[PDB]
Scaffold this active site. Sequence first.
Site, PDB file in Angstrom:
ATOM      1  N   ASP B  25      24.070  77.158  86.318  1.00  0.00           N
ATOM      2  CA  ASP B  25      24.118  76.914  84.887  1.00  0.00           C
ATOM      3  C   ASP B  25      23.910  78.124  84.001  1.00  0.00           C
ATOM      4  O   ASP B  25      22.771  78.533  83.716  1.00  0.00           O
ATOM      5  CB  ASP B  25      23.013  75.876  84.652  1.00  0.00           C
ATOM      6  CG  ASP B  25      22.961  75.341  83.239  1.00  0.00           C
ATOM      7  OD1 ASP B  25      23.767  75.776  82.403  1.00  0.00           O
ATOM      8  OD2 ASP B  25      22.091  74.506  82.954  1.00  0.00           O
ATOM      9  N   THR B  26      25.038  78.664  83.559  1.00  0.00           N
ATOM     10  CA  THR B  26      25.020  79.802  82.675  1.00  0.00           C
ATOM     11  C   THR B  26      24.414  79.473  81.332  1.00  0.00           C
ATOM     12  O   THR B  26      24.034  80.409  80.625  1.00  0.00           O
ATOM     13  CB  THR B  26      26.457  80.403  82.432  1.00  0.00           C
ATOM     14  OG1 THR B  26      27.360  79.385  81.954  1.00  0.00           O
ATOM     15  CG2 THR B  26      27.007  80.982  83.724  1.00  0.00           C
ATOM     16  N   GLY B  27      24.299  78.197  80.955  1.00  0.00           N
ATOM     17  CA  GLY B  27      23.703  77.834  79.683  1.00  0.00           C
ATOM     18  C   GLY B  27      22.212  77.589  79.830  1.00  0.00           C
ATOM     19  O   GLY B  27      21.583  77.004  78.943  1.00  0.00           O
TER      20      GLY B  27
HETATM   21  C1  LIG Z   1      26.327  65.638  82.109  1.00  0.00           C
HETATM   22  O1  LIG Z   1      25.374  66.087  81.201  1.00  0.00           O
HETATM   23  C2  LIG Z   1      25.595  67.342  80.577  1.00  0.00           C
HETATM   24  O2  LIG Z   1      26.573  67.944  80.866  1.00  0.00           O
HETATM   25  N1  LIG Z   1      24.578  67.766  79.539  1.00  0.00           N
HETATM   26  C3  LIG Z   1      25.163  69.011  79.065  1.00  0.00           C
HETATM   27  C4  LIG Z   1      23.619  69.715  79.140  1.00  0.00           C
HETATM   28  O3  LIG Z   1      22.707  69.317  78.529  1.00  0.00           O
HETATM   29  N2  LIG Z   1      23.572  70.701  79.985  1.00  0.00           N
HETATM   30  C5  LIG Z   1      22.457  71.528  80.390  1.00  0.00           C
HETATM   31  C6  LIG Z   1      22.170  71.088  81.780  1.00  0.00           C
HETATM   32  C7  LIG Z   1      22.000  69.612  81.991  1.00  0.00           C
HETATM   33  C8  LIG Z   1      23.065  68.893  82.523  1.00  0.00           C
HETATM   34  C9  LIG Z   1      22.996  67.521  82.739  1.00  0.00           C
HETATM   35  C10 LIG Z   1      21.862  66.848  82.410  1.00  0.00           C
HETATM   36  C11 LIG Z   1      20.780  67.558  81.871  1.00  0.00           C
HETATM   37  C12 LIG Z   1      20.860  68.927  81.667  1.00  0.00           C
HETATM   38  C13 LIG Z   1      22.678  73.017  80.416  1.00  0.00           C
HETATM   39  O4  LIG Z   1      23.855  73.417  81.007  1.00  0.00           O
HETATM   40  C14 LIG Z   1      22.968  73.703  79.202  1.00  0.00           C
HETATM   41  N3  LIG Z   1      21.874  73.814  78.280  1.00  0.00           N
HETATM   42  C15 LIG Z   1      22.239  73.801  76.862  1.00  0.00           C
HETATM   43  C16 LIG Z   1      21.143  74.167  75.902  1.00  0.00           C
HETATM   44  C17 LIG Z   1      20.825  75.466  75.494  1.00  0.00           C
HETATM   45  C18 LIG Z   1      19.792  75.689  74.571  1.00  0.00           C
HETATM   46  C19 LIG Z   1      19.094  74.608  74.084  1.00  0.00           C
HETATM   47  C20 LIG Z   1      18.049  74.653  73.180  1.00  0.00           C
HETATM   48  C21 LIG Z   1      17.402  73.431  72.788  1.00  0.00           C
HETATM   49  C22 LIG Z   1      16.344  73.371  71.891  1.00  0.00           C
HETATM   50  C23 LIG Z   1      15.903  74.535  71.367  1.00  0.00           C
HETATM   51  C24 LIG Z   1      16.518  75.720  71.748  1.00  0.00           C
HETATM   52  N4  LIG Z   1      17.552  75.788  72.624  1.00  0.00           N
HETATM   53  C25 LIG Z   1      19.428  73.341  74.516  1.00  0.00           C
HETATM   54  C26 LIG Z   1      20.430  73.115  75.404  1.00  0.00           C
HETATM   55  N5  LIG Z   1      20.533  74.125  78.605  1.00  0.00           N
HETATM   56  C27 LIG Z   1      19.340  73.616  78.655  1.00  0.00           C
HETATM   57  O5  LIG Z   1      19.010  72.541  78.393  1.00  0.00           O
HETATM   58  C28 LIG Z   1      18.374  74.703  79.075  1.00  0.00           C
HETATM   59  N6  LIG Z   1      17.763  75.287  77.876  1.00  0.00           N
HETATM   60  C29 LIG Z   1      17.698  76.540  77.536  1.00  0.00           C
HETATM   61  O6  LIG Z   1      18.123  77.439  78.150  1.00  0.00           O
HETATM   62  O7  LIG Z   1      17.034  76.816  76.308  1.00  0.00           O
HETATM   63  C30 LIG Z   1      17.104  78.111  75.784  1.00  0.00           C
HETATM   64  C31 LIG Z   1      17.321  74.345  80.137  1.00  0.00           C
HETATM   65  C32 LIG Z   1      17.955  73.716  81.337  1.00  0.00           C
HETATM   66  C33 LIG Z   1      16.649  75.601  80.625  1.00  0.00           C
HETATM   67  C34 LIG Z   1      16.296  73.413  79.564  1.00  0.00           C
HETATM   68  C35 LIG Z   1      25.416  68.941  77.625  1.00  0.00           C
HETATM   69  C36 LIG Z   1      24.588  67.897  76.873  1.00  0.00           C
HETATM   70  C37 LIG Z   1      25.328  70.263  76.917  1.00  0.00           C
HETATM   71  C38 LIG Z   1      26.831  68.600  77.617  1.00  0.00           C
END
Ligand SMILES: COC(=O)N[C@H](C(=O)N[C@@H](Cc1ccccc1)[C@@H](O)CN(Cc1ccc(-c2ccccn2)cc1)NC(=O)[C@@H](NC(=O)OC)C(C)(C)C)C(C)(C)C
EC number: 3.4.23.16
Lengths: 99, 99
Positions: B25-27
């Site tokens: 997960d690059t995000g």
């Molecule tokens: C099938 O579900 C998904 O694909 N959920 C995708 C999702 O949430 N992806 C997450 C991984 C994930 C997948 C499936 C279920 C649950 C989680 C990540 O790819 C992308 N993402 C997207 C993202 C990036 C930043 C933030 C964020 C949120 C609040 C405050 C600041 N930054 C939130 C979400 N990151 C984070 O949530 C990360 N957050 C992070 O790195 O924070 C700096 C975590 C992990 C370390 C907690 C989306 C909702 C974006 C489509």
Amino acid sequence: PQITLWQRPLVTIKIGGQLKEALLDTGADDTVLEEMSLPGRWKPKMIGGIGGFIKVRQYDQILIEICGHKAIGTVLVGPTPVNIIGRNLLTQIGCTLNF
Amino acid sequence: PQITLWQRPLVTIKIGGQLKEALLDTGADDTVLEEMSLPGRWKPKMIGGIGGFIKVRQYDQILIEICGHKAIGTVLVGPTPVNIIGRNLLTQIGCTLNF
Ligand SMILES: COC(=O)N[C@H](C(=O)N[C@@H](Cc1ccccc1)[C@@H](O)CN(Cc1ccc(-c2ccccn2)cc1)NC(=O)[C@@H](NC(=O)OC)C(C)(C)C)C(C)(C)C
């Protein structure tokens, strides 16, 4: 372009005539943008992440330019903390992971 | 290996003597895993995502073997819906994004 991950993989995109920066997110099935203005119609939808679920607007067949590459697909708009480019669009621009 | 994104980029990882599948997960700034048993001490920490925030245990210098490549870094453990391998570990196995 090849991009390393020491920093957030942010790219400039052009959508709805506007410019934004978005995160290339391999862990995202969908593409999610923060509140912005888009033309046309949509359908309600909910999606999940870490923390729970958010309510979004869903828009199909939307043109988007990611770092100069064009792509058309579904784009979600809503209360996301950051603009996210998901797999639905990453596949179209030929993006891959390598190690 | 090179990996396309038509599917979720899952890999097998070995951690704490146990086998798991995890998402590249690059995000994700951080690496987060579902409740599991790990040795040693930790601390309480909070992390944010799309629906809000979750509380996790933080472990430093944990060894993980990702698709056969070894890396030592911080691993968080808690109520995540899916195991996530974040950039803090992706950089160690030389993983890049390409298009
Ligand atoms: C099938 O579900 C998904 O694909 N959920 C995708 C999702 O949430 N992806 C997450 C991984 C994930 C997948 C499936 C279920 C649950 C989680 C990540 O790819 C992308 N993402 C997207 C993202 C990036 C930043 C933030 C964020 C949120 C609040 C405050 C600041 N930054 C939130 C979400 N990151 C984070 O949530 C990360 N957050 C992070 O790195 O924070 C700096 C975590 C992990 C370390 C907690 C989306 C909702 C974006 C489509």
